[PDB]
Write a protein that binds this ligand. Structure first.
Ligand code: CA
Ligand code: CA
Ligand code: CA
Ligand code: CA
Ligand code: CA
Ligand code: CA
Ligand code: CA
Ligand code: CA
Ligand code: CA
Ligand code: CA
Ligand code: CA
Ligand code: NH4
Ligand code: NH4
Length: 389
RNA sequence: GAGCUCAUUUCUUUGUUUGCGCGCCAUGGGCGCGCUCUAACGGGUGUAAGUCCCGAACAUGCCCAGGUAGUGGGAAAUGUAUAGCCGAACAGCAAGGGUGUCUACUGUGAGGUGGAAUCUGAAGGAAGCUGUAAGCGAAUCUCUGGUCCGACGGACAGAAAUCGCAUAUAAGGCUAGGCUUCUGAUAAGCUGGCAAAGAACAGUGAAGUCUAAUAACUAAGCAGAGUAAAUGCGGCGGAUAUAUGGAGAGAAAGAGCGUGCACCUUAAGCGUGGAGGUCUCACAGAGGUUAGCCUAGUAACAACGAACUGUGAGAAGUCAGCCGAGCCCAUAGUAGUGAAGAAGUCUCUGUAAUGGGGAUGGAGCGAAGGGGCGAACAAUCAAUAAUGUCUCGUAUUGCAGAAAUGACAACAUCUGCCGUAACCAAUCGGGUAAAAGGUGGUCAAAUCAAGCGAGACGGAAAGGAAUUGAUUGAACCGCCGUAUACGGAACCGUACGUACGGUGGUGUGAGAGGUCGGAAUUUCUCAAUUAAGAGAAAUUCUUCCUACUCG
């Protein structure tokens, strides 16, 4: 029980509080905010410290209150280094210095190694199907402290930053079995795919690993979405895969259901009847573009960024033309952006038909690509080339 | 540049002048009555032709094709070509109105007046004027197409308000494509990538009806992509003089002018009125200074400061539903209205609500804008002995790990085809725990048992199952009924048009735009490549508005 002191050492408590206030969490049903635990940890810090050391502490019934979140962070920031030396190298889900892009690159490395038959595994409702007793004794093989059984019990049948770590302990046995059988895999947390060399070997691996997960782990495989694929019809962590006509290189790409989400968010951010300034639309669109590129910066989006840049500039021309709002102002702003007054007056009295008018000619020349890049709109193609060509 | 394609309406609104009361007047409408006309101009049928019927010159539309245009012909359609109506999102004139600006006069001043410049002269009364393009142009009756309406409300609650279904990780429409299967005329309307409504232009185009004439020359289905300030489809009922597209009857009315009517009505016309507040001046008081000079500053409040308050004479000047029944102030019980008849009373009959007649009555009824009090409405807030548990022992059970010895060499797990094939990755026949194999032995545990719990048994801790009073509703979006006007019939609008009555919704921020007025910069023109200047054009800033978009 000497680990319990490092769990409740006050520097780790203040670091957990810093992680909470930088996390900016939300209150639960009780209604206690992240602001208020300074005086509450002054008022009740000895109370909760003694209550945890004497094994009597109350749960919360979604989003937990920030005291339970804060204690969960305080125990998960010390339970993690001791569990890092046992975790597999191809486990990338909620670990320090590990992200989804590492999983995609390792997937491509194994994919180009010669294992291009994918055993996609979908676990059905992960945290609602794990037996608490097997998970808790799995913790109890290497951990001196068992106070986590109160959270595990009375928050499921009644998460924060302890539940993904416990998910990683529960799937670490699966990862050890995969290394035991000599199978290659990549695993984000409860999102794992096996790569093997042939069809009927992939079916054998699917049957045996579903057998192992159901019997010797205690969770059920969702058999309706566990599918033996190729890396051409797989959606893994938002990335689809394809085969290049280069030598033996499989390449990643954003999946069509991720491009659809980006296009939906782009169409929302460039709605022409959105009553904010076009500087604000350009700012939020740059935030969305800049957050969507550097997650998919691995993989090929040359033509996709070209098409999306063209669509973004078309919708921004429509937004600016709708915001000009009158044929007099459309004519004036068209003249002072370069167009002659006769052509600008003919175009501006087609003020309606916004989509036709912003498609071609005078508005396409006036609101140019340089006029939109100097406006502040970063281009998807040039940003993608700047990050990873 | 969007995706070889690709070149667009030189337009107006929903959004910013005015919006009060009372009175007058039609140049508007209603009902009469007269006088003229009415189908290119002629004929016929006839008692009666505006109606019914027949007659042909040539200009456009369309066809005849001759890449397109020009000569020669031909089938429908239109015009010249009905009396006459109307006047464009067409011009011109324009009485008037606004201006913190420039200038002359005037007043002690608040201000006023006349000019100059500029905006405006409007969808609600100079019932503005003039000239048009285009459009229209005959009672009724039947059939039919299109459109619109049967509120609003993302179409729910509500409400007096057509039904049903669908509709925002977007119905639906539309634009540009992709793949398969494959005779025209009239012309309301529909659509043109979507806030929605109209105009322009273009393409199409329902229902009927008409026409199948002549001569040649020089589209549907299918998946997607893109695009929305949301409605779409069907049933039922109604309207339809933009004199709605037509078809059939129909000897049927239509138009202009004049004139009557204690006939009706209108918001920018004409008279008149103007409080409450806001300023200006002069007197008195209240004071800084020793009755003599000053009385404001702080948008405003609060609060300092001598700087406050009356009285009189003046000046500009109002005037929009948002939650308001009623009362108070002052113009004011005055203007106005009423004896061709009020208030009050009775009676009859309507609406969801506002009402409308009839009898009696013998004289009252009665404004304007602004502010205050405020019943009420909407929202938010405040005052007003069981179970389960607490802690001790008892019997346990969930899940690790270690393993005396048995039973089977059979269970797991990982690479994953065979033949034809002169060589096929189901490119060919099958099959996907297919061949051929590699690796770990597998299971049961007699016992032993960590750590965290979990419900049971027993004895001692216990506990208990309306009103009043405040604050907010700043500012808006509409919609419907009746009366009444208009743009542009419907739709959409004119501050929800306005007046009264009824009914839902948004919530004090940001953005975008418009802008009477002012200031500045540039590009010109002007002289002569002088003028701080005159005529401008463009842009920016400022003043004002938030009806618009999003929350
Ligand atoms: Ca309006
Ligand atoms: Ca004409
Ligand atoms: Ca509606
Ligand atoms: Ca659609
Ligand atoms: Ca016609
Ligand atoms: Ca008028
Ligand atoms: Ca006066
Ligand atoms: Ca109000
Ligand atoms: Ca309307
Ligand atoms: Ca107005
Ligand atoms: Ca409005
Ligand atoms: N006004
Ligand atoms: N309104």
């Amino acid at each position: 029980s000497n680990l319990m002191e490092q769990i409740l050492s006050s520097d780790n408590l203040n670091r957990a509080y810093l992680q909470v206030v930088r996390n900016k969490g939300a209150e639960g049903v009780d209604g206690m905010k992240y602001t208020e635990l300074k005086e509450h940890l002054a008022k009740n810090g000895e109370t909760i410290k003694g209550q945890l050391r004497t094994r009597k502490y109350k749960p919360q019934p979604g989003v937990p209150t920030v005291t339970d979140r804060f204690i969960q962070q305080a125990i998960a920031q010390v339970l993690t280094p001791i569990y890092e030396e046992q975790f597999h190298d191809h486990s990338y889900g909620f670990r320090p210095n590990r992200c989804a892009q590492q999983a995609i690159l390792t997937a491509l490395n194994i994919m180009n190694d010669g294992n291009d038959w994918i055993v996609d595994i979908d676990l059905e409702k992960f945290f609602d199907t794990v037996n608490h007793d097997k998970l808790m004794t799995l913790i109890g093989r290497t951990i001196k402290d068992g106070d986590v059984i109160s959270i595990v019990r009375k928050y499921l049948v009644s998460g924060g930053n302890l539940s993904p770590l416990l998910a990683n302990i529960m799937l670490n046995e699966l990862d050890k079995e995969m290394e035991k059988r000599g199978l290659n895999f990549v695993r984000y947390a409860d999102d794992c795919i096996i790569m093997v060399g042939s069809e009927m070997s992939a079916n054998r691996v699917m049957r045996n690993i579903s057998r192992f997960i159901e019997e010797k782990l205690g969770l059920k495989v969702n058999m309706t979405k566990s599918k033996v694929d190729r890396p051409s019809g797989l959606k893994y962590l938002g990335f689809g895969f394809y085969f290049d006509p280069r030598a033996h290189q499989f390449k990643a790409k954003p999946h069509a259901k991720s491009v659809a989400k980006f296009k939906k968010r782009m169409k929302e951010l460039t709605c022409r009847s959105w009553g904010v300034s076009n500087s604000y639309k350009v700012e939020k669109l740059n935030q969305l573009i800049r957050g969507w590129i550097n997650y998919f910066k691995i993989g090929s989006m040359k033509t996709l960024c070209k098409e999306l840049d063209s669509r973004i500039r078309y919708r921004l021309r429509m937004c600016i033309w709708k915001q000009w709002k009158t044929p007099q102002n459309q004519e004036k702003n068209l003249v002072k952006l370069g167009i002659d007054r006769n052509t600008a007056r003919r175009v501006a009295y087609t003020g309606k038909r916004i989509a036709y008018v912003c498609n071609k000619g005078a508005v396409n020349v006036a609101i140019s690509n340089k006029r939109l890049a100097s406006f502040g709109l970063i281009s998807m193609l040039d940003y993608y080339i700047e990050k990873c060509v």
